[PDB]
């Protein structure tokens, strides 16, 4: 039921998933600066150059897309999910606290982009926690407890 109720907020993030998702990157990098470091491909890079940056956009894209494909997914959640977890733990390595991080994020600019009402953001915010909790019992399943 919350991943349908997101989508129906979901129509101007698929719209335009390179705009959003460089607000997503910004917004993240702006509010919590040691998630960019996390990215070595954006590490460095001046704050106010970022709104701009096509490659810092392009991935906030591929960020959004894979959420949406969750969203819409008729199949196996894990089918998707458990990859996720596999990347992120070790090629990656990205503490578990950075995705309720860039889901605050998400939530903000939904609520600013989207229309995201108070019963959109409590169905986002549980589709978050869904999502969170099984990447963290995944890596928990490859040794990652930190
Ligand atoms: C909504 C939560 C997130 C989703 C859906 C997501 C999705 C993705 C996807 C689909 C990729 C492509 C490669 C792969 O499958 O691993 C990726 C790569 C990556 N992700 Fe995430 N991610 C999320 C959160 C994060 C966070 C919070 C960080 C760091 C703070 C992070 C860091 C990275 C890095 C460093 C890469 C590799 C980028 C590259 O080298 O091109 N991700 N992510």
Known sequence: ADF???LKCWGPVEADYTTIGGLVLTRLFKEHPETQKLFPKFAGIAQADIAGNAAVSAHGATVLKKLGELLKAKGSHAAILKPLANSHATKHKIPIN???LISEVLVKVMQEKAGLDAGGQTALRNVMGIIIADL????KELGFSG
């Open 4 to 6: 349908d109720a997101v």
């Open 98 to 100: 950075n995705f309720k």
């Open 136 to 139: 963290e019992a995944n890596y």
